[model samples]
Target chain A: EMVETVCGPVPVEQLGKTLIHEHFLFGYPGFQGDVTRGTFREDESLRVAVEAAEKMKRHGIQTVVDPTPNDCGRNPAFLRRVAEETGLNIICATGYYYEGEGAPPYFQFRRLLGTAEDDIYDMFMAELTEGIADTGIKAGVIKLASSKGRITEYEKMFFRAAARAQKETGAVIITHTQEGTMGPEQAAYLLEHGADPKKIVIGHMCDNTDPDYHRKTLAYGVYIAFDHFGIQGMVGAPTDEERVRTLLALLRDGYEKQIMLSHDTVNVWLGRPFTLPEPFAEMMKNWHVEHLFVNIIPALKNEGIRDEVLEQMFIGNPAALFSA
Target chain B: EMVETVCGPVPVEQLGKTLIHEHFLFGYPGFQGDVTRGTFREDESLRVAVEAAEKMKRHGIQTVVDPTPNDCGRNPAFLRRVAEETGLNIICATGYYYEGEGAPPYFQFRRLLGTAEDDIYDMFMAELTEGIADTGIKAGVIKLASSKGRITEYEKMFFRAAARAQKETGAVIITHTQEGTMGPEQAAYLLEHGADPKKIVIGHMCDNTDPDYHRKTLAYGVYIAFDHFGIQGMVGAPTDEERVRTLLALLRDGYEKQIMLSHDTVNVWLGRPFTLPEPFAEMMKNWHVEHLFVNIIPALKNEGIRDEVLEQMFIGNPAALFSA
Candidate 1:
């Protein structure tokens, strides 16, 4: 079977050096205003996305999985154009976002339906089995996220639905853990609910520097993502240096096989975000799509991480994740 | 079978003098802005809603179906409170609105999952068989809609889903017709797709004054709602006087059994609606739940419509539709 992508299905092996979580656009559900900070202009946004993807493609990024959940400006058409224009495999996601922080009342009703799990299961399964809308682009990953500290009932509903869909479709399950608190919980729940651990990635693990958290999450044999490498000053995330140190700590503990990395970069803004002004922008320079290839790789090499281990992260892990 | 209500299931025969269409709150999906034109404050809004229902209750109203589809602030709790406080039976709906015009991407995703028909069927059947969320308050109707003059593929998808839901749950089908268009098409499609014609009500029929349109829609053996009775000078709808005139004409045409009436009043708003500030508010004064009972019924009596015919339009038709 092939990984369904924005440009249609591609053999899993073709997804070399994949960036698992990123966004071409991330619009909050309630912010459909002018195309300033919190909105999109299709043509301009398309140009910006294609240029960014081209930069990543030149740096040997073969595939990018944009797990921008349904609430967050997930436009399959724009992603399709970006994939076609940049000649990079772009896979879009289909699922809800964080319960209180991101999702709208539509998801609130998910809890109100006869059974929230059944409604969410059918919703995500349809996207995996059929296609999103009339777009005919089936989602490759089922995305689930929880708020910081505690997983709400709404979020657990999503986890159950994601696991059910994964069991049926073998679609990879990727997740967001607020402030690194719920990675272990997210992993354990999905696995207990019948998700294949090998097909799961507990994303945003780098938000906290606790090796014990990583140990617990990785103990399940699921991939732990050091995914938020670039966004600085965001709530609950350690610095990039701390992330790299955490990575080395995990690797030194021999959890290298269960690790993946990404920037979780936003190339297009669909909602009002904290904008860096003038000289402050210098600090955010490495936050772009090229951060990993240009800076992190050199940093890893300087820190004496073996090339084979790096290769496993950049290539082998993503390929195996989708090889189902 | 009983018509499930916010209070609990009520035998269909007891759903007396029902207002077929109205809203406790009509929150726009994604418009969670300050509750300006469309927002609602619970205590104050609940007071207003309960008071209005009390007024209708005094005027011989027994049940009011708030066909506020899933996305539009369909709060079963608030509705339950209204029913309990006012002693008027309030039946809520389960389904979706038209796309672009009303529905958010939340529903657009529902169409993406498997067949939209099957997904919608499961959703409404769950509400009818079980309860909305864990409220133990089941929905009494399957609410659906189409845009003006056209049954958009999205809207038609809702129609097909509603049909499947109606076929399964034996729930009544309620609808919205933009500017009085698509009434006959809505009837034909639902009937063609196995919806019980007796269970269908084409809403907003009063928006158009064309007798031919009403004649054709009524020919389907479905109830036709002169729902927009008091909202004068809205796009495409005739004046309430003309709405009554059309009702009289249809009554003279011997189609009293197919008739229904309501004010389509918005008792509670949920977000920003297009503003009609200042003097424009004067025109919408009669667009309240009490307008039909206090004004229209008196006017219809003055125009020589028999009390028995008015009784059938308000009571018998609604009872029959929900009697499935």
Candidate 2:
């Protein structure tokens, strides 16, 4: 009856309201030890992340799933600390991100040995079963990604591994879709490979405006995360207004049971210039992790998306995602 | 009671006539899944590796430490097959290589997150204790490297991690010293950081012709591997005759117990142009794993190295290195 967290297992019901995807700390892979990149102050970064998690808790959030993959800065020890200090259930991720974006050189190297799907699946399964890197913190989710507008051959290999892992471990699945592309492909690949569709959450669906795409993905019995609730106007993406509209439309179609929500917020930075740089920092003012409650939820109620659907998006859907 | 092999564990006493460093299969990290690089034929590659292992067995080799790290094609399942078919103990590695020279993109990405020593230590220790990638094949040695002649900050992180892994698990630590610059430094770093000196091997020491360097590394209570036996004059290297002379001089100085020998040979290529290409393949004609028995040993005997030293070079030292 208990689910794994960065802080250890907790009763599933204690998960309360949850955010399906948000980063307490974000360090893209290649930057961690690079002197050319910015310096990281662990104390400063931890403080910021704890403050953000506390703010999110005040907004009625209980669990935050940080699906930062292996090639990205996925730190269980840091997440554990954030969870301990903030008193929130923080779940970290295991897997890789899109190639040329977040997928590291090792991912490319792993491709050389062939039977890549088998190799990748082994890595994911180990993280889930044996705990990640001797930290003894097992991942509760598998995070995979497709690059912009395509399921590049390498990315497809990752999805294959993700599917096998999900089928074997009953772990929930989440993903990244650059510019809202490849949502249907991600779902089809996972379903084709025997993943339990109910445990899959196709993330960043709010970045796509096509209802047919969202509908097709949900028809596979998976959750379509309108998770990008606050990221707006970065080009090739619909505005926050559009994302809200997509959620309401999905709700209107009586697929409320298959929806989840989050802001994909990265509260602390790990490498380069040491802080969130220009354009991004300024643009993300209203895009903080609490954007869901501060702006989106009020708008949902005001727009007549019933409180029941709101309850599912906030509470019930995430619980089901984590439950056996 | 047993030493871990890629297939499973074997009685340590059964690990007779071992070569400390050799690769039955080597596919660079970023090149495997890439068809644009070349298609990988697993069946053909496995055949090539098995044949080589069989040939090596004929040359009196029993256990081959295929220290192909994760960034390389460290395929435990394939290696297990190589072991089963050829009846030779095939051990694999579970750490990263040097950066710029061999460390993959993910290694760099990992460096960006900071606290890299802890991150790396966790990975190496996990692979040594838990079976690798669900294959239930634990690593027998910790493979690490330095970039070129110096230890980069990133490469030092690997050495630190290896030191810790060796301390906790009593796993043997092997290393690659590019162009022989960091052999002494590698020995110093590991010994200074709690690694048992007797369990450490500074590989590729043969690349350095200076007697002082060899004498200095051996002084640290560690093994200096003359591992590039048949590799001749591939830029910035002494002739094999010179390497033999250095071995004889070291032995005359009563350091036979502190020296090990290997070829660091690559028998199977995973992707691209299938077979070894260019002038290098032709150049490496005598660089096969059998080079020591077929060529180097006869030359060493001719050089007047004592019979007892020869026995230690081939058997005693390796057994002592792997002995608990």
Candidate 3:
């Protein structure tokens, strides 16, 4: 049931509901050894995260999308953690991230292999048509990231390859953004090159608390994600009132289907951040998990961000994001 | 400076490096209400996104492209805010974002306005050739989006309009995407419809990070984006480590000039995010600016990601992405 993206089929549904954008299993460090910061091995850490998922199950939370790709330590084993402990569905990815950015060794190996772009193209088709690493987890969504706030040629080549892969596979895409309304920049570039914009989700549209920010992103006909709605380290990105006001405005504006929400919860340091970026230290205190479960939802309810809107961002939009 | 994007201004020195995928004053909530996402209120919301631009004054970041379009709240006023604050070179957009999913009410109201696609075409042309919002922000890129996952009839219509706009104004288009690697789909659709693949940036190619994934995307020879380095929480899944690894390797293997990086940071809020939505909460915590500094640059640094490589992801790659 969880496997069913708007594109089609997620296969497992363990919990009562799902958090389509949670990352429990990830290796933030890269190929050589930078992955030192990630520690999915902590037993209590595993227990607590599972316990939370389980608790969520009782509260109607069932599955999740652990889109941790290779560089981010796309550990299916970790995904298995939540599955085994909480009996929830955990969807994983089979694709890559951005360039000169968060990508894996295999991605670069193509260049070193001096494989022609056609060869690379064939590989993408193979993965999408056949599977990732020949495993069954066909990438449900295409993942891409652009930097310096624009699409460079190197990036374009990568995008084309992805576009080809999609044609071969029919996978939808979720993206990593760097700046505001970047979804449009990448979206326009992708569609022009070959990507179908319908299946894309321009994430972090709510990174800005301006309700209009959400409206701008939703204007693309794709999905606008409020992937990270909590945590105030330095800047006051979104208080509960702000989210309520903004979300209501967007919904009122009629962007419900295009909306998807999540905490993007990360307990990297056992229920708390191991260390906060100093620049964001003052705002760091505001980061907490309750924001996901208690704060935002209730506040929205109070401010009139109803079940329909909630379902859309949580269940409905996510279901559609996955299904389409 | 605007001419720097195409003609001979990009000698790599004084062009003041543009953040081609920026939002100066795009309306966000405004569109959802009446389809315009209203006029963006720059009112200090654009402070930080352009912070790097400040650094650019010394390090060379200039000429930022606020590619936010009409339907999605492309406001020249807010863009002025960014420009006024960062003193960075800012360029606004014309045209519009893709279909109804995240579209401008103006477009929705278009049919009702009795302005056929051709009339809208003229409007887009006017924006591109004449100037955006009459503020003379003069759209640098023909920003667009695509929904329906496959080029639908409506999207095709917009593309035709965009093509005409591009043809008349000589604007290079930076686009938005939907699913993973819809390159062939959009390619077939656009080519069949009459748009040149070379004139576009296969935006969001980073959405698919694997070598195999991008192989197909690059074959088109169009520029790509590795933008959206941070904000993985909202972009469908987590940062896959392997994909990132592959991305750097691609750079090493020499797709450098094509790589670009950015955080896609939206000033959604200017205050404390004490309690937030599930998505926004998580997103606030995960979406960091150094995504380039810590994640990509460092990952590349450790993985032997280099200056020449940086040149590609940074300078050279953008050269290709912005090429007309």
Candidate 4:
């Protein structure tokens, strides 16, 4: 089986040592309004993002799944340019973000007018099977997300539409579980809606500390991603030490095959740069794409995890998920 | 005093036979996604909009206040072209839409990060004073809105920010009152926030049937607009007969100077044309830019409204509002 990349479709084996959750560029909905105010500099942004992607390539990362959904500044052209310049396999996603923080007004208005289902399904199907607009860049994955505690009704419509697209197009499903709260529900909902379990990835599982919570989601036979690595001490997330301990426990209990790892770092922010508070800024010291290679791997090695087990996470699992 | 127009600032007296609320072009938020799907045709849209403006010009309309807010498809360049071609004065707006059906997520995200107030204030001030994104066409009005029943907190931030801009810039404030509800509250809120009552226009008063509702809003010394003149038989709105009766009663009660009239017509819809239901299509038969001249004026004149009273609505009142 082959997976679609920004450059073109490539054999699943070519997606080696993949980082399954990262963004080349992202803005919350409505960032376009800020472009008029001179917040986004396209040329400078391209330079910075290429620099990041080139560094990732040098660190032995071969592929990146940029799960930037439709409303969140998902620029397929930018991703394609990054792929062209860096010679890295780039997989972009087709979907919407969760309800609370994403742009839901468009779909909500359509819902009120009773055309939300059809419009959403058509958008997902076209972006996955055909391409995004006239760009001719087909999305490789379907991204879905749920609110912090539950999947909103508005979000459920997107889930249904994306699941239909995924089943028809044989694309893998990746998801956002807001602060690790809805991982099990997201996995179960997608599975119930005709998504293949093996082809699904519940992302941001590292944010939660409960081993039972991790186990509950993994028990569904879908892969759970510890994708928010290097992001620590924020709301609802544990330290890297706790994440490593929890991950080690899960790996020892034979759930290694159903786990993926990544750092959900944003390469370029679309609007005005946010001024992070002092403590939050301090906590984000290691929050970058390379932190997984430089910091987390050594921590896991110190905890007695074998390099071969790590290879299964970085290579074997992502390959199988995309292939399935 | 002069009012800013898309063609440049014009003496207020030049704005004769004006339509106070209309859209040269409008789309709900997220219509840009549909542009990729071949929904918007710019050349065809310009032709249609220019044709409409020319027709309005022939009907003795001298100016149009297009209160299309930021989240809607407010195209100042399109308005400028139409004005340049048809020689009709076009006053464009700067602000966001109401909460329920508008794009509020961007501001909501900024609100979560505690920068929403500054960002919204900056946008309103810059658009109204410095012009919208270097087009050099400064917004002549600040548009604001309240959702049905009550204003949400998100909508209030826009109100506060716009109120500040209006106070500083001396731009008139026009508002959307969902189904004619919250008109009085909206007026009161702006008044409390240091906005000039004479410079405020409460819109969509035709949607409500009660004379007390009209009186309550007008009692704040702000103008109340029976703008949805040709729109009838919809949810939360009475027929043109009821609107005429309520308007005539207000006129008879010596409130003619505080009233404005228009057809809140859309010249071009932004995305795919909405397939209006049968009843809606029938009701919208007269929902065009010239409906006031072709239909509503004849109906009002038949009810003993003199030409001078009608002039106050179509010519004198609009000039006064803009001059203030």
RMSD values, in order shown = 19.8, 13.1, 23.9, 1.9
TM-score of every model versus the real structure? 0.55, 0.56, 0.45, 0.96
What is the C-alpha lDDT profile of model 4 across B52-140, one tens digit per residue?
A: 99888888988999999777778898899888888889999888888665767677878878998888888878877777876789889
Predicted candidate 2 versus true structure: per-residue lDDT over B168-272, tens digit per residue:
889999889888688889999898899998898899999998899988898899988999987864757767888888888888899989888998888876555
The segments of candidate 2 whose C-alpha lies over 4 angstroms from its true place after superposition are: A1-324, B111-115, B233-235, B274-279
Cα lDDT over the full model 2: 0.78
**Number of the top candidate by lDDT?**
4
For model 3, the stretches where C-alpha displacement exceeds 4 angstroms are A1-16, A31-45, A99-131, A134-136, A209-213, A234-243, A268-273, A277-282, A285-290, B1-324
A164-188 per-residue lDDT for model 1 (tens digits): 8887788898899887789998888
CAPRI accuracy category, model 3: incorrect
Chain A TM-score, each candidate: 0.94, 0.94, 0.79, 0.97
Give all candidates' CA lDDT scores. Answer: 0.78, 0.78, 0.54, 0.85
lDDT of 2 by residue, A61-101 (tens): 88989998665667788888888887999887877778645
Which docking category, incorrect, acceptable, medium or high, applies to candidate 1?
incorrect
- What are the DockQ scores of the candidates, in order? 0.04, 0.07, 0.01, 0.50
Ranking of predictions according to TM-score: 4, 2, 1, 3
Candidate 3 lDDT over residue span A1-324, tens digit each:
445321234444222355656666443322111111121346776776676666556657766665554444454454565666666666565444554334323333334334434444654455445544423444455556665467655456567777777665556677666544366676676677677666777765665676655655666677766667664542335554555567778777777877777666654321112334466666545444445666667767776666766776677666555543
**iRMS values in order, in angstroms?**
17.8, 11.7, 21.8, 2.3
Residue A258 Cα positional deviation in candidate 3, in Å, after optimal superposition? 0.8
Q: Tens digit of lDDT per residue, candidate 3, span B1-324?
A: 234221112343444344445443333221221111112234445655456455445545566655665544455655565566665655555555554333333233334334437755766666555554335544556666676356555566677777777666666767666645465455555556556666676555556656765666666655666655554544353363644766766775666655456545444321111244565566546354335654566667787766666655555555554554
